[PDB]
Amino acid sequence: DAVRDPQTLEILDITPCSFGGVSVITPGTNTSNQVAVLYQDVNCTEVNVFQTRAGCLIGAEHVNNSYECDIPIGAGICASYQTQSIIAYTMSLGAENSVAYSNNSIAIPTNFTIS
Amino acid sequence: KYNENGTITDAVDCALDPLSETKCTLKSFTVEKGIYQTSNFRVQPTESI
Amino acid sequence: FTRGVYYPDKVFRSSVLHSTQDLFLPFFSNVTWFHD
Amino acid sequence: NQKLIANQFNSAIGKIQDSLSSTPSALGKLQDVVNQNAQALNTLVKQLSSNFGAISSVLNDILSRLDPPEAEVQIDRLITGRLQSLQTYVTQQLIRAAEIRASANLAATKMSECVLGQSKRVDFCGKGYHLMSFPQSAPHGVVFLHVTYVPAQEKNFTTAPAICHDGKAHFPREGVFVSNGTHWFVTQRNFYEPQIITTDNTFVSGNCDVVIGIVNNTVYDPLQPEL
Amino acid sequence: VTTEILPVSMTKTSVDCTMYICGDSTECSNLLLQYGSFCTQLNRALTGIAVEQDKNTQEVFAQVKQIYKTPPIKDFGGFNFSQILPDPSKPSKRSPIEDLLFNKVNGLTVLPPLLTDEMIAQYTSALLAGTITSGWTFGAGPALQIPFPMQMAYRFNGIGVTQNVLYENQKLIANQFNSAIGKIQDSLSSTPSALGKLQDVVNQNAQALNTLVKQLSSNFGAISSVLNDILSRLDPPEAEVQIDRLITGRLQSLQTYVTQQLIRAAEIRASANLAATKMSECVLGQSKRVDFCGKGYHLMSFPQSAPHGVVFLHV
């Protein structure tokens, strides 16, 4: 992990060269031929460029709005084809639903369904 | 892509683009929606010290 | 474009996809045009 | 509500038929199992044609071309490679078979508990309050149609843990006390069906000076109007 | 109150067969090409395990389609849920019990889990909100609010005890529950062997990885354990045999590692299925199975997140 230069009395750290898997994120070819490239655990400087905990994503535009996951990328990032291009975003774990809780209120169903 | 008559109707170059690499690694002419591991990026050395 | 593909060998195959490595003209490659 | 339930069930089975006809990914598990088996077999066949460092991948070619002193080494290398490939294939087959056995045991338990009876385990026989199930065969698989009951339309009401009538705390026997803002009733837990507060569905225990949040109202005893 | 700890997922390790066997050597790769598609099969198995990890996590946790949040007023008949509910003070938005749980615990890469710790904590918070405010109604369909005293009355009625004993002994039950949760907090803080299962799983994974790394440095009868040294010192006629021996040893070591990883992953999947069943039956409702949701007549349960695991507080 660390070495000493024989000539100059200095200590140098040796880091293994960056490497990692390369995956393709794309919708079905029945829809479009546009693709995005994901590099695992590689900084974007060593390679629409986005940096996430999963690595470096090229070809996808990150947005702020959240939706349900469609193509899981990882580390809180999921991608989707939206009108059109491929975008990446943080998931929403479901629509928030506050319950009107109290100490003297009860909700009782009046109709039912057979599923 | 061979036909039923022994002739080839289409060809895909694996090194053309990432989509073509996905087509080659899936060994299928149509790519379904999802994510597929295709290659392995490796930084190569530039100098010898 | 997509020209320059030839049969790799004299083998009959029916309705199958075959991945083979050999000398091929790259797709969409830049080829020289002579008029000489 | 017999007719409504029958119509809802018929519409539901029609929708299930349409979904099965349309959605191709509904049967992903069985197709995945079949694809895994085919991939394993094809991998074994491909490995049969490998060299494993031998001069050739054809046994006859090695036997004819190479002398027995060297053919012995070549055959040893080939059989070592083929044997290790076969061992790997059989090991992964064993693991997959163990997984399939676990799934089949789960399926047998599901058929024994959800089909041959009514199960009280939540979400074991489908979402919602499970009612019944229907088994159907499929290539190397079983498909359960779970028929379940789901509450649909809820309404808000004022509640009270108990009612004090004449110093006695009355608790419901099977339901819960509700109020629409003017009168109090008792309704079953999972459906709205108000009933007049009577002594036949309430029992007396303790006094209203201990329970928290008791309310004031009257309880009906039909005997007094009867006489 | 009893504590039940169950492992859920394991580290998603992915190892490149080619680089691990051959340290970026053209001759080594050429020799390896004669073995067919072994490395492809090994990578496929590792990818399957990695996907199964996320599948297990989603099955265990993502059983609710909505994110519920508790009302600001913490009025629950005297029951105090501060220790189990998430707090806004910590940036992770984790419960103090969750914080205590988290504090007490070469060609290879680690893929981060799809769900981060924050969203797992959010899912647990939603589960606790649903259990507290709606009982089991939210699990079986729409979330119907229900005040806590009648929910506890229903839970007592479920085990053959009438509700009048609850409504006549509310304060004692609340005090006993508060003392019990305090004792659980103290036991978690003091006892280090309570979380033995998760630590054992992590230690097993680390031991497997370290064993693989050590076996990378073995000789397997070769003249040397360094590929470059063999290539430089030995002629290609003998370097071929030396490289063959080295790659055979490394390949068999990798196969053994992947096989034991597969067995451990199958065990983890069985444990995760048991945990999912436990959450579906003990948390989203009241279970009549004796000793399945803790000793004694089970009343309810509270889930809590932990590194690659779930902790159930069975009341």
Helix, strand and coil content of chain A, in percent to the nearest 5, comes to 5, 50, 50
Instruction: Answer yes or no: are the C-beta atoms of E124 and E234 closer than 8 Å.
Output: no
Comparing C-alpha atoms, which of E206, E245, E249, E199 is closest to residue E108?
Answer: E206
Radius of gyration (C-alpha) of chain A in whole angstroms: 24
Q: What DSSP element (H or E) covers A109?
A: strand A105-114
- Binary contact (B29, C27; C-beta < 8 A): no
Name every residue whose Cβ is closer than 8 Å to that of residue D18 and which is 6 or more positions away in sequence: none
Q: Which amino acid is at A107?
A: A
Instruction: Please tell me the distance from the alpha carbon of residue C34 to that of residue C17, in angstroms, as a whole number.
Output: 36
Question: Please, which chains are in contact with D (at least 3 CB pairs closer than 8 A)?
Answer: A, E
Resolution (A): 3.5
How buried is B25 (Cβ within 10 angstroms: 0-12 exposed, 13-18 middle, 19+ buried)?
A: middle
Question: Alpha carbon of D55 to those of A7, D71, E34, E243: distances in Å?
Answer: 50, 9, 10, 17
Residue (of D134, D174, D181, D131) closest to D156 by Cα position: D181
> Cα separation of E119 and E71, whole Å?
20
User: Residue E178: exposed, middle, or buried by beta-carbon count in 10 A (0-12, 13-18, 19+)?
Assistant: middle
Nearest 5°: the CA angle E210, E212, E215 is: 110
Yes or no: say if E111 and E14 are a contact pair by the CB < 8 Å rule. Answer: yes
**7-66 of A, contacting B, C-beta below 8 A:** 17-31, 33, 35, 37-39, 42, 46-47
Q: How far is E147 from chain A (nearest CA, A)?
A: 5
Asked if D205's CB is within 8 angstroms of E164's CB, the reply is yes
Residues E186-217 as b/e (b if ≥16 CB within 10 A, e otherwise) read: eebeeeeebbeebbebbeebeebbeebeebbe
Pairing state between β D163-164 and D215-216? parallel
What's the token pair of residue C17?
């996809």
Separation between Cα atoms, residue D220 and residue E294, nearest integer Å: 43
Radius of gyration of chain C (CA): 14
Please name the amino acid found at residue E260.
Q
Interface contact B3-C27, CB threshold 8 A: no
User: Are E47 and B40 an interchain contact pair (Cβ–Cβ within 8 Å)?
Assistant: no
Token duo for residue E137 = 């109604």
Q: Does A102 contact E145 at a Cβ distance shorter than 8 Å? A: yes
Which residues are registered as beta bridge partners of A85?
A: A82
**How many other C-beta atoms lie within 10 A of the C-beta of residue D33?**
17
Q: How many residues does chain E have?
A: 315
C-alpha to C-alpha distance for E198 and E203, rounded to whole angstroms: 9
CA atoms within 13 A on the CB side of E247: 26
Residue A98 sits at the vertex; the CA angle it makes with A93 and A99, to the nearest 5 degrees, is 125
Q: Which of D92, D49, D54, D89 is nearest to D70 (CA)?
A: D54
Sequence-separated contacts (24+) of D44-50 with Cβ below 8 Å: D44/D85, D44/D86, D44/D89, D46/E36, D46/E37, D47/D81, D47/D82, D47/D85, D47/E36, D47/E37, D47/E38, D48/D82, D48/D85, D49/E36, D50/D81, D50/D85, D50/E34, D50/E35, D50/E36
Minimal CA–CA distance to D97: which of E248, E207, E157, E266? E266
Q: Is the CB of residue A74 less than 8 Å away from at least one CB of chain B?
A: no
For chains C and E, having 3+ Cβ pairs within 8 Å is answered: no
Give me the total of CB pairs closer than 8 Å, taking one residue from chain B and one from chain E: 6
For residue D129, give the nearest of E140, E144, E288 by CB distance.
E140
